[PDB]
Amino acid sequence: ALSLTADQMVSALLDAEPPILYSEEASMMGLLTNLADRELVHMINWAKRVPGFVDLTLHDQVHLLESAWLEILMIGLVWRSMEHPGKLLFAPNLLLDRNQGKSVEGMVEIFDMLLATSSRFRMMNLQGEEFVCLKSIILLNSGVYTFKSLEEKDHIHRVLDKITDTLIHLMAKAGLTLQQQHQRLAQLLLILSHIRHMSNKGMEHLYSMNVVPSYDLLLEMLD
Amino acid sequence: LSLTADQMVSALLDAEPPILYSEFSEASMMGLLTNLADRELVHMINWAKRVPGFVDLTLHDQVHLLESAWLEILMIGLVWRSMEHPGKLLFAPNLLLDRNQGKSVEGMVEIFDMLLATSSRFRMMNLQGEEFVCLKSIILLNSGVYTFTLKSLEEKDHIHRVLDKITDTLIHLMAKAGLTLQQQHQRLAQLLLILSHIRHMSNKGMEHLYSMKNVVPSYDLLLEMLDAH
Numbered sequence A: 001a002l003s004l005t006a007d008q009m010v011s012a013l014l015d016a017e018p019p020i021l022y023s024e025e026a027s028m029m030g031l032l033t034n035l036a037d038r039e040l041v042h043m044i045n046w047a048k049r050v051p052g053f054v055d056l057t058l059h060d061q062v063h064l065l066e067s068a069w070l071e072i073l074m075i076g077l078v079w080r081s082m083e084h085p086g087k088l089l090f091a092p093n094l095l096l097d098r099n100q101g102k103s104v105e106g107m108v109e110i111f112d113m114l115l116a117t118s119s120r121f122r123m124m125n126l127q128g129e130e131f132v133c134l135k136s137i138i139l140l141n142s143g144v145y146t147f148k149s150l151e152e153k154d155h156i157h158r159v160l161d162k163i164t165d166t167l168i169h170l171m172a173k174a175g176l177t178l179q180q181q182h183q184r185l186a187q188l189l190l191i192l193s194h195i196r197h198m199s200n201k202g203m204e205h206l207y208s209m210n211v212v213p214s215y216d217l218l219l220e221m222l223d
Numbered sequence B: 001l002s003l004t005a006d007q008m009v010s011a012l013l014d015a016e017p018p019i020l021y022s023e024f025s026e027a028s029m030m031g032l033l034t035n036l037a038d039r040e041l042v043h044m045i046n047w048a049k050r051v052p053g054f055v056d057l058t059l060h061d062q063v064h065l066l067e068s069a070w071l072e073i074l075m076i077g078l079v080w081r082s083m084e085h086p087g088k089l090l091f092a093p094n095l096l097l098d099r100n101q102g103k104s105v106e107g108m109v110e111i112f113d114m115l116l117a118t119s120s121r122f123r124m125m126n127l128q129g130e131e132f133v134c135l136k137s138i139i140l141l142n143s144g145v146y147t148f149t150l151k152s153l154e155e156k157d158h159i160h161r162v163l164d165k166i167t168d169t170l171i172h173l174m175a176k177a178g179l180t181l182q183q184q185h186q187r188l189a190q191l192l193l194i195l196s197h198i199r200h201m202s203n204k205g206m207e208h209l210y211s212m213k214n215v216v217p218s219y220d221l222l223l224e225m226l227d228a229h
């Protein structure tokens, strides 16, 4: 895992991308819940293809997915919605705007944060290569502060360090100056703080109404 | 936005608020911590108004940024004060608590466990003071910028330019310390990913404060201290 080149890390992450799933006012939360449940399975198979992930124990793989899964669903939604300003593309047959999110209490606040994240992506001209790097960072970093355990944390940080090398490489070969490379790297990672914030408020909203996937479910999906 | 990296560091170190003291029983613990945080918030306002570029914003946006960031800023200051005291949080020099004293309140030890892990991460990275004040200023400018008109557009462009000047400042600090370009990028990323956990901590932290209940500084109170005459 730690021997891959920057170009090979990108190629591995791109090839590992999950498919875009389809949907099957009151029934809206039923559709969105069922869509997320089916996405999670493909998320598990994506995670196993993130270089270095399967080197961790099963127990540590599950905990990483427990802490990261909602963030990953969200950043994928934000990416899907990037070229659809003012709307969220949950699925190709489920394109919702801000108005349809007002039906549920506490819903449009998260809707607006997702819309603003997608606009932020738009005006940074986020590239697919960068997006898959960002998604893998969320997987490895979201649970690292909440765990042999020293070796696992060291391994996680080594892989996080190579993704950083990979993001700098993509920026460098795009023509960015060294100053622009540091600045863009920081800009992308500060967005990860807003995604974590979005995921926290999203979880609170979910709990205000089977909220999280169980440890046994995640473990079984890992196979 | 005209400062050099050294002038940025120098200004941020000069803006650093003082370390305050608590004014022992677990029953009075929340009263002491609440009073301490309330007094820290006054000095936080003064500190924020000295962070370069912050006063260029409208008072309205200044209030909004502090509304979104004040808990994060209190928490990172706590973690910084606790860095050299493993397994303990130094709320004040006369108020140093361990994990067993955080068990008295439901849901306290979980957030407490999170703060201890961040303190240990600061130790593991040998976080420097110059890096710490840069992180704190990034928290101020970044946490509320994604949740704000033409004025609003000009504000976010200015905030991102100041955030860019701080990123340059972090890199210059590591470059002066002999780290390679690779090590500079990697440490930059490691420091900024901690901000995700600090936002996470402040989020459960806000949940725990509402679970107890004057939970948050009000908009009018923040505006009053910011809007000086």
Ligand SMILES: CCN1CC(Oc2ccc([C@@H]3c4ccc(O)cc4CC4(CC4)N3C(=O)c3ccccc3)cc2)C1
Pocket: A029, A032, A033, A035, A036, A037, A039, A073, A074, A076, A077, A090, A106, A107, A108, A110, A111, A114, A202, A205, A206, A210, A211, A212, A213
């Ligand atoms: C055991 C796990 N199951 C229990 C289920 O929890 C769910 C239930 C529903 C969602 C959807 C969903 C679906 C697919 C997607 O790609 C993304 C999302 C995004 C989002 C934010 C989270 N969501 C919403 O409706 C929403 C709410 C308020 C404001 C805006 C959007 C995700 C997870 C999953």
Ligand SMILES: CCN1CC(Oc2ccc([C@@H]3c4ccc(O)cc4CC4(CC4)N3C(=O)c3ccccc3)cc2)C1
Pocket: B033, B034, B036, B037, B038, B040, B074, B075, B077, B078, B091, B107, B108, B109, B111, B112, B115, B205, B208, B209, B214, B215, B216, B217, B218
């Ligand atoms: C109106 C504004 N008021 C101020 C608000 O109330 C309070 C009351 C108390 C705290 C302390 C406090 C004080 C000083 C510090 O530097 C840091 C902190 C940190 C922390 C997490 C936040 N806190 C706790 O006790 C705690 C809780 C659960 C787990 C661990 C620690 C902050 C704010 C309401």
